[PDB]
DNA sequence: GCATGCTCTACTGCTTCGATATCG
DNA sequence: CGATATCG
DNA sequence: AAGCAGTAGAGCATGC
């Protein structure tokens, strides 16, 4: 049966993953036959047919109906008849275990996406039959040694050890501590006959050996390291899963699972982290059934180490001023600006997620956060997503650990603030408005060191030639800085106030596009509101400047004239007498919404105007 | 309004030319962002009547601005945007048009820049396309405009490219819209197109200008419309335009501009039949370039090539049908090419669909070929179509959007075949049922094609042989269970009613275009619909007080997924069967009525049965069918008098259905016994005034009674029909009220005088008496200076009626709340003046408002009733008359007509009384107590031995609700229990000939079952 | 399954400013 | 030199 | 000829 089924499989299937157009009936015939084969598989626990499906599972890299096979593994993973289930498990395990000339992609992907579902999805917590038949079936190959003369057997040694690591890991993923501690068929399996000691024997040497793993340095290895990285991080996953399968009853991770001593050229983190390719990082990112049946009769989250790291620190929070295991140790490993980019870049995206235990201890991990976030270390234009993550986390706990107190942190805030207003434009408007919101949050939490760069804002809005709105960033940033506080006392450190406000009224005179002069009128009138709130400054100069510009409007500009007057009067009452007779004059013939607008204008000053009623009556009130 | 219009009229009149044109361009383009984008008839109608002025307006604007050379901006923009406006408006521009014609002719005659010349001609071509031959030619003669633009082509040369295209386009359209009188000017117009074609493409030098070719061929095609050159007049210009199609269809690759392929293809797609002999020689290269251009990676050239190819294949097949001698090798190439198609080498999606249609179309002329090639087909074809759909479970890849054409090929091969291989009929009949299920996820002009295909295959698979015609019944019987199983996009039932309407009998706009049937379809449909009602078994059962009614709390069904399966069916009959009952339904009434009555009699309390019966009797009134075959007459006149007494003890919709059945007999010939029908028409108006249609059909039957029944037994029966119709006079209520007054008038003069003067004293006068002769309940509204008394009783017979019936929930609850406080108040005064003449009219509406319908008003007044019973049945206020009035109110609330919820609540109430009576009293002075349980039992005995047909049902229901009690008492559970057994047995025997429908016997049998276990 | 929208570009054309045959 | 069309 | 003036244009992307 196996022979004739294999013969038809090689008779009428393609070999590659798709090798076809997705939607041709040839593709539909292929998915038809594969659906029927899973239809046969889904209720008969056949250790012949499970091997016959898993051989055509890993033909190529990634097929189309992968999730169908995950669902069927969840189906066969519990079906009753527990002896047959472990029969399937041991069948596919032994087809993994033997040796034949193959490609090691297959030898990896078997033990990745074939039986880790079956052990993960619930078989039984009493089904320790594999836990009895695996101890002296893989500890012996675990204690092997590297045949580093021919690579073709060396990589298979690596692949077999990696498979054994992932099997031990998924086996320790779901087990209590008592059926590892007491005298059952793990200690009593690895030993011949029952012993007297408390069963904490093989656990300790297993922790020891997987800790010798992921600490053996490649200081004399430059031959095959890509699989060695997976070897090491899977060994660390083994260590954390066995220390979380035991209830880790003691303060233990100061001397274990951490704190490499590099005097003998040791390492932990630069082993498992890549350290060659920096994250290049795209920045931003009932009987009717019966009567029918009778008729029927005729990016770093996807980086192979992140998830268990997040899980272990989540356990460290959810179960248990400075801690030398991971507080002070990773503080030294992140706070030093001599470690490379990737260690700190990865170390961000765990304390970002698990900041909740860092809520009473964020002040230490806030200074190097800004140290890495401000200066150029990231790439692109500052690692956008992680940038807004870092500063959003920081200003989430506003009222604790202000960026002031450290002068380097104050000037770091200044230079980062300068940078984010420098590169701000982004011609897709939604995230541009989001960027302006970001700047609004930063300037509303900064509050102490202003460092508001003039000649920079002046450089942004000072562009002439009213045909393109390159001054729009200047006026929106003007609205941000003047929206709360911070008056523009310009000739103290920047340039003089006179040509400053003259350039602003010049940008008002840029009558080309809509929102530029609209917001120019708006924020200019709010500047007028503050400089009339404080008349100690010579406000009347810029008063007659904007009045002069309005007079140069009102001759041949009338539609723009009435609306800029409307904006500056909604900002500011007492500048209407200069043109009150003019709007009283050309009240009519402005039919449309501008009639409503100039009515809103003449609404302004009626507490002091004498004899308006004749005016309104002769002008059709 | 003219706001921005006045702005434009004031900026036009100044200097600085091209500046007023800039304002004109900008302002009509700003009208662009105002005119269309509000889905409104009202304010858009305001904009139309604002813009269609001829005093001001854009037409006289160019009268101010035609003699202005640099004003190219208006001459582009205003007739670009108003072209869009002319497109958006409907046909309401037909007298709004001569001014547009004069304006556009003037603007075309004085345009300046060719970069601004096109939209005035866009408006031209848009009006001349959107408005065809009509009396608009009698409005303004386009035959005058034809001579005009004949001038502006004939005395016109060196117009460079674009208007050079547009003059030929508008010229051909002038040849298209009503050319009925053009004889000798239309002679050389084809030569005029061919002259430009010759000077473009009869010399390799002077590289051919592209779009003017397509304009000339569009004009040639459009003149050929209604001047069709059949290949009988000149076989030379048809030859040369075929050569020009050939030059239009060459595969020019290394470019994107592809207009002239679409031009030649749309020329080919209309005048295909007029070609005779030039369709033969280069057919293989035509085939190859066409099939290549089916995959020409474009948007509409794809559809142009598909239409051209299928039209050409249809034409050459209709040719080779009559050319069944010469083209043997040609069809031989077609057969082998199409077999190479229909074999899956790697056929992706459409190269097989474009040949399956042609192959089934070739199967017609494939008669004298092999008699076995046709049988290699239709197993190759069925095997080919069977693999695609009917897949796994839930993913998609629909493809049944084009399966109609495959059904067409199936039918067209299957018409001429003989002796079917017939192993694949359970796949064919599993195909048509899935297609009939997959109707409502379609679109119009595909739903109707799908119906065309299904009626085509039913025309195929019925004329073959009677050994085969069973499938046409099996498929519709299965499809009924398909479309009547849905949960009551996801449809419910409302996309197949139109299907069955224009499929069953009114499919006579389907037999025209596709190369008895209605009889077979109607017969199969009625067979299936009587079949389905068999295998349902809707026998509802008991889930967890003593319920006493037919459709009571016995509610859970054995198949709770079948109630929906039948209520989907009954309306599906009601919306289908009255479609042309003029020749079909007449023989079926006896058997259908008989089966429905037999199913209805074993289970009477299921609505919709009578609805189907009502459909049958309405058709039995539509056709005549009544003269007394006599068996059905006798059957109905039995069954009506059965159900007329069966309809007593119901509440709502079973009531609605049985009354709308009872009042719908033919009854010109059921003249006897009107007295057994009038207690239904005295209720079909009384249960109106909160519901229309029963109160409509009652008048609709009183219409027929008066003019068709001889007026002699009618004449005493008018003091009962008319006097309840007066509650009206105080298709909705107003049309029916005008109908009522017309009936009441033309009913006669002497008869309608009964309507007002009948009784005048039943309950109106009792409400019009005081409830006590002397007023009581002084209430002193508390103020700061006055405290004046107001006697709190005079308003009570309005509060106590409005709290019963309002249809006004905002204060019905308020009236109940203040009435609660009012009863609390009358307790508050009488605690220290007798009111036992007031309790007697207070209580038997208080219990009805305690347990009527709603839940918050039942949350109140139920512990009120309980607490007042607790206060009444006591010792400090023992044996006053108010206890007697409460007890008597309880007892005659027990024995009463139709009020079943109140009957059962008073059963609960007498259980409450029976518990608290033995709870409260000490036997030291309880020897002369009228509250004693012996007195309650003696009252129950006098209730029991009684010829009033409800008076003992009250007692047996009381015993049903008290045999839970006295299974714990002593000194009473022993002595008179078999005496009461004798009493109940004698009343049971006296109930011999009441009716089984009244349910007394099935109550007293449970009473004696309660008796026998407690004695044993 | 057809019917429909945002892309921003490459070909094609229009306008426009210079040359230039051609018969007496 | 005076028109007279055509290119580019 | 020489800069611009414009939409067809497949390619992608949306939706019922």
Swiss-Prot record, chain A:
Q: Where in the cell is it found?
A: Nucleus; Nucleus, Nucleolus; Cytoplasm, Cytosol
Q: Where are the TPR repeats?
A: 14-47
- The PTM N6-acetyllysine maps to 261, 460
PTM entry text = Autophosphorylated at two clusters, the T2609 cluster and the S2056 cluster. Autophosphorylation induces a conformational change that leads to remodeling of the DNA-PK complex, requisite for efficient end processing and DNA repair. S-nitrosylated by GAPDH.
Q: Which domain of life does the protein's organism represent? A: Eukaryota
Family listed: Belongs to the PI3/PI4-kinase family.
Instruction: Please state the pathology the record ties to this protein.
Output: Immunodeficiency 26 with or without neurologic abnormalities: A form of severe combined immunodeficiency characterized by reduced or absent T and B cells, recurrent candidiasis, and lower respiratory tract infections. Some patients show dysmorphic features, severe growth failure, microcephaly, seizures, and impaired neurological functions.
Entry function: Serine/threonine-protein kinase that acts as a molecular sensor for DNA damage. Involved in DNA non-homologous end joining (NHEJ) required for double-strand break (DSB) repair and V(D)J recombination. Must be bound to DNA to express its catalytic properties. Promotes processing of hairpin DNA structures in V(D)J recombination by activation of the hairpin endonuclease artemis (DCLRE1C). Recruited by XRCC5 and XRCC6 to DNA ends and is required to (1) protect and align broken ends of DNA, thereby preventing their degradation, (2) and sequester the DSB for repair by NHEJ.
Q: How does it assemble?
A: DNA-PK is a heterotrimer of PRKDC and the Ku dimer (composed of XRCC6/Ku70 and XRCC5/Ku86). Formation of this complex may be promoted by interaction with ILF3. Component of the core long-range non-homologous end joining (NHEJ) complex (also named DNA-PK complex) composed of PRKDC, LIG4, XRCC4, XRCC6/Ku70, XRCC5/Ku86 and NHEJ1/XLF. Additional component of the NHEJ complex includes PAXX. Following autophosphorylation, PRKDC dissociates from DNA. Interacts with DNA-PKcs-interacting protein (KIP) with the region upstream the kinase domain.
> Can you say what this protein is called?
DNA-dependent protein kinase catalytic subunit
Which organism encodes this protein?
Answer: Homo sapiens (Human)
For this protein's source organism, the top of the classification is: Eukaryota, Metazoa, Chordata, Craniata, Vertebrata
